[PDB]
Amino acid sequence: HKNNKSWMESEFRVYSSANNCTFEYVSQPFLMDLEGKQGNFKNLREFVF
Amino acid sequence: EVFNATRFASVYAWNRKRISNCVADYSVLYNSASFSTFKCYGVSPTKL
DSSP, X not given: OTTTTSXXXXXXXXXXXXXXXXXXXXXXXXXXXXXXXXXXXXXXXXXXX | OOTTOSSOOOGGGOOXXXXXXXXXXXXXXXXXXXXXXXOOSSSOTTTO
């Protein structure tokens, strides 16, 4: 967004409609950054569900 | 936000608020001397 001079994320194309909401939770982001450059000797993420 | 709500709801479009994953303290309800009607069915306010 040029007006706010920052990157924004609002086009949530993932889903069309939402109904029958049963749970909602928001908290701090885990293990993320924000840069488009190139890096060397960085880290790996591993999750188990 | 439901009991002390700023705006009201029309009955034909009665609002419904879902409450989950948060501490419930129903003692705050009958301790507040602001409800002229308090009737329960299948449960008692004392044991809530």
